[PDB]
Write a protein that binds this ligand. Structure first.
Ligand SMILES: CC(=O)N[C@H]1[C@H]([C@H](O)[C@H](O)CO)O[C@@](O)(C(=O)O)C[C@@H]1O
Ligand SMILES: CC(=O)N[C@H]1[C@H]([C@H](O)[C@H](O)CO)O[C@@](O)(C(=O)O)C[C@@H]1O
Lengths: 165, 165
């Protein structure tokens, strides 16, 4: 019956809905207040240096203060995680499975994850006996067909390397 | 069993994991490719003026070309949705349940959702009998104790106004 959070297999709610302390999605104090697990918590969840390096759920920005939110106060000056307004360099894996482009910037979409993708959620990164025993980055699994990814198709039967089974 | 997407009650995957066409979380072509429902799809999901105004799942940015992603190309110049780098004015709701601050900026966190919050996922916007019949915004439900919100705690038993069930 649970929807989200520790009760719901780590799932997030859609459209910034807060995950209550009991693992259901909604807005208002019962969801976003004390115990809020993810979404638009109020106050924002603690993050970055102020929470042992934990990133914000739902790709919220981690403020200079170490709270999760959106707006200039969170994503602008002093932003330490999430979709900060500053370009994010990599080479230092991108946080939260963002793709490190060939040019060493973090992002998502084909410009980052496609041709030349170094690491993160790359579209099509080869591995295993199909790619000279090449290893996957980010501790992903090498699927039977020699593609890097996560989930049953890559970590399940036929898995060549990484955290198989 | 299912984790995400239509099959998983509209849940999102954590850490930008892609929701496959079958409603499971992962990375690689099976999850992020054709039929990808959310997360770091490759290519990014269509959005904005290229998807009938649909916003990106997981607070991804909608590029000027109508694809979901992160990075300068998506959040920077031409961004039409998500956590664009430009400040977003309001007064005129915010998208994706973002709070409209008393000053007329969209965001999340106390500076937006706290005192003076006009709309969206406000921390503690009073309503109903406790607020002299005041109505909630965003078609939220007024809970029994007179706070605006969504979910069973606000739209369920005791719901005063809004789309009670
Ligand atoms: C996919 C990627 O890395 N794109 C980055 C590009 C590339 O480095 C190209 O080399 C420059 O066009 O550089 C930027 O400064 C840019 O021009 O916007 C940031 C952008 O995120
Ligand atoms: C890409 C994807 O969603 N794969 C999932 C598959 C698909 O649902 C079936 O291949 C559809 O026929 O089912 C699993 O139980 C599996 O076989 O391990 C989980 C796995 O994550």
């Amino acid at each position: 019956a649970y929807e989200c959070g520790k009760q719901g297999g780590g799932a997030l709610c859609p459209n910034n809905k807060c995950c209550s302390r009991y693992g259901y999605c909604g807005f208002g104090p019962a969801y976003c207040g004390t115990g809020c697990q993810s979404g638009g918590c109020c106050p924002g969840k603690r993050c970055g240096d102020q929470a042992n390096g934990e990133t914000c759920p739902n790709n919220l920005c981690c403020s200079e203060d170490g709270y999760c939110g959106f707006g200039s106060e969170y994503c602008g000056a002093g932003c330490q995680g999430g979709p900060c307004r500053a370009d994010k360099l990599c080479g230092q894996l991108c946080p939260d499975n963002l793709c490190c482009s060939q040019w060493g910037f973090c992002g998502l979409g084909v410009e980052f994850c496609g041709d030349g993708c170094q690491s993160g959620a790359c579209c099509s990164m080869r591995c295993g006996r199909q790619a000279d025993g090449a290893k996957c980055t980010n501790n992903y699994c090498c699927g039977a067909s020699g593609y890097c990814g996560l989930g049953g198709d890559y970590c399940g039967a036929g898995c060549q390397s990484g955290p198989c089974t």
